[PDB]
């Protein structure tokens, strides 16, 4: 039966855009978008064996059916349609799309090799969408981006009943975000690894609570799939089958020096001094008294140094960092102040968000939901 429907332009264009996000760059049928008109409305879906996205939109179905059409072209067309209802009609091998005085005739793709969407696993728990986007955004910045070390390209998701912990690392920084969710099924104790680029994109797209589907019982993760369910939206992501490194042991129990300072002021001053850093390699940080002196430079390009007042306890310390790793971390705190936890110039520094608010030390590690652990670079 030939599909035929009318739909509101904004509803259609949004949904198609959303699906076309997780659509592959280039088997050519996989970049197709599937339109199915049902008794309830229009389903718009895309799948590429790794990631699937399905959205349900209101529509006036004059004639039920389905059709596969090129995903990119459909997205481009729908973004540029005028302020008029959209009417879609399949007639033979063509799909016709009319909107006001505009008429598009597109070839239909072949279904005979178009794979059915995977079923989502059973529900595991529910997170408010704004929290989910923040946490995922925070840890994703530390994820590795090199497919030759696949374990690093995932976000580690560990579940302990009502507690969820997200972690990511690329060997130079480690991001760890703890949060609370409401479990839906039974109380659950498992860990899973999810492709970070995918998961960060889904979270960043937005939702208005997010239902995560990893399964339940002791069978959590057995489908090898992360399902994400939202109002009118369903998506799946293939889990990563790779052992994640043991990161928790890297979080120091105490520090020999700590430092507290405004995020915005530090970030601005870093960027300013780093302008003269050779190939953006390193920025130097000297802590002493109530002063932090940043410095950077190169032989043939020039030198820079800048002073900032700081809340600093412990013995004077000079430690160096990759400026970008550093501002990446600062930028992901989402707080006014940052607290640095140090030991030596050769050992990881702890960045935690501070709130509005002594002695010689050593200093107990603060308890926070979020931490960014940054490896220093060697001073020349």
């Amino acid at each position: 039966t030939d599909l035929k429907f009318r739909v509101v332009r904004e509803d259609f264009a949004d949904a198609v855009a959303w699906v076309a996000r997780s659509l592959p760059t280039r088997i050519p049928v996989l970049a197709g978008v599937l339109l199915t008109g049902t008794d309830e409305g229009l389903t718009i879906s895309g799948f590429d064996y790794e990631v699937s996205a399905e959205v349900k939109v209101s529509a006036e179905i004059a004639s039920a059916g389905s059709v596969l059409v090129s995903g990119r072209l459909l997205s481009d067309i729908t973004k540029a349609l005028p302020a008029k209802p959209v009417e879609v009609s399949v007639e033979g091998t063509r799909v016709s799309l009319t909107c006001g005085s505009a008429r598009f005739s597109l070839p239909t793709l072949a279904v005979e090799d178009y794979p059915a969407l995977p079923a989502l696993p059973e529900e595991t728990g529910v997170i408010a969408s704004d929290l989910f986007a923040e946490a995922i955004g925070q840890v994703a910045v530390a994820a590795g981006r090199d497919d030759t070390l696949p374990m690093l390209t995932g976000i580690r998701v560990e579940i302990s009943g009502e507690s969820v912990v997200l972690a990511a690392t690329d060997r130079f920084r480690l991001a760890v975000r703890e949060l609370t969710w409401v479990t839906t099924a039974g109380d659950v104790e498992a860990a899973v690894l999810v492709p970070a680029k995918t998961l960060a994109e889904a979270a960043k797209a937005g939702t208005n609570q997010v239902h995560l589907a990893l399964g339940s019982g002791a069978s959590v993760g057995k489908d090898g799939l992360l399902g994400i369910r939202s109002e009118g939206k369903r998506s799946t992501t293939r889990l990563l089958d790779a052992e994640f490194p043991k990161f928790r042991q890297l979080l120091p129990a105490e520090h020999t020096a700590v430092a507290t300072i405004g995020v915005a002021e530090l970030t601005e001053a870093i960027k300013r001094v780093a302008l003269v850093a050779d190939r953006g390699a390193q920025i130097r940080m000297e802590f002493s008294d109530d002063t932090l002196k940043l410095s950077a430079g190169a032989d043939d390009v020039g030198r820079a140094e800048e002073d900032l007042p700081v809340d600093f306890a412990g013995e004077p310390l000079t430690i160096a960092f990759n400026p970008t790793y550093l501002t990446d971390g600062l930028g992901s705190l989402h707080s006014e102040r940052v607290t640095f936890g140090f030991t030596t110039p050769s050992r990881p520094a702890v960045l935690r968000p501070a709130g509005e608010d002594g002695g010689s030390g050593p200093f107990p590690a603060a308890k926070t939901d979020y931490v960014y652990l940054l490896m220093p670079v060697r001073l020349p």
Binding site: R171, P245, F247, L373, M375
Partner: peptide, 10 residues
């Protein structure tokens, strides 16, 4: 440019 003391990983 040392790495984090991840074990394994460095």
């Amino acid at each position: 440019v040392p790495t984090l003391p991840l074990v394994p990983x460095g």
